[PDB]
């Protein structure tokens, strides 16, 4: 799961 | 035969990929994400349970550290379809892609430190936790993320  | 198959991501099924990601992951991606993944072809598939889209995997290629790494941005499926082998199917698919050219050093991804079930899933296929980046997520708690890498070269 990529950023933020 | 098989009632769980993978399929392409086209501009005709993009909103379905996007919907899935909204339900599966607690972060939101804007449409840059969804424009970029239209260009990676095989590095992004949808998972079907009889023509119902249940999950997806989306990758990206990073050229840095003098390495060509595969980055898994998103891999997942809706809750009631978990523990069916769908994620294995998609992971094995990205693995099958990395070893058709041999130009890859590693594949890596980010996992929230609380997500014990994703940690258990990746470490099963030989991803090790190489780094814990603090405050990697902006909008959610816990904010820390492990860097799970698998080695190829
Ligand atoms: C993590 C995830 C992607 C794996 O998807 P999945 O389709 O359920 O996993 P699979 O059925 O293909 O693989 C299951 C195997 O891996 C291991 N595994 C997967 N999830 C596990 C968990 N709940 N805890 C421990 N073992 C697990 C098991 O040993 C299992 O084999 P088994 O069914 O015989 O017990 C899925 O749970 C998911 O979508 N989570 C939400 C999305 C997410 O948080 N993504 C962030 C990182 S991908």
Q: Please state the domain extents for chain B.
A: 1-153
Beta carbon of B86 within 6 Å of any ligand 1 atom? yes
> Is residue B108 annotated as a catalytic residue, yes or no?
no
What experimental approach yielded this model? Answer: X-ray
Q: Residue B122, CB half-sphere, CA atoms under 13 Å: how many? A: 27
Binding site, annotated residues of B: 29, 73, 75-88, 115-124, 136-139
CA B107 to chain centroid, in Å, comes to 11
Beta carbon of B88 within 6 Å of any ligand 1 atom? yes
State how far the alpha carbon of B54 is from the alpha carbons of B42, B80, B106, in Å.
18, 9, 27
CATH class of B1-153: alpha beta
Any idea how long chain B is? 153
Q: Which residues of B touch A3 (CB under 8 A)?
A: 27, 110, 136-138
Among the options B12, B71, B93, B146, which is catalytic? B71
List phi, psi (to 5°) of B55. -165, -170
Q: Which residues of B touch A4 (CB under 8 A)?
A: 27-28, 137-139
- Resolution, angstroms, 1 dp: 2.5
Is the sign of the CA dihedral B138, B140, B142, B144 positive or negative?
negative
CA B101 to chain centroid, in Å, comes to 20
């Amino acid at each position: 799961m990529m950023a933020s | 035969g098989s009632r769980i198959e993978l399929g392409d991501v086209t501009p005709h099924n993009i909103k379905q990929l996007k919907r899935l990601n909204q339900v599966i992951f607690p972060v939101s991606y804007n449409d840059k994400f969804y424009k970029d993944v239209l260009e990676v072809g095989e590095l992004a598939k949808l998972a079907y349970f009889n023509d119902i889209a249940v999950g997806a995997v989306c990758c990206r290629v990073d050229h840095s550290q003098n390495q060509k790494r595969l980055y898994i941005m998103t891999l997942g499926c809706l809750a009631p379809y978990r523990r069916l082998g769908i994620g294995t199917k998609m992971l094995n698919h990205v693995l099958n892609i990395c070893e058709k050219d041999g130009t890859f050093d590693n594949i890596y991804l980010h996992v929230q430190i609380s997500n014990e079930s994703a940690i258990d899933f990746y470490r099963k296929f030989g991803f090790e936790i190489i780094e814990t980046k603090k405050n990697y997520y902006k909008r959610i708690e816990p904010a820390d993320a492990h860097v799970l890498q698998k080695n190829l070269k």
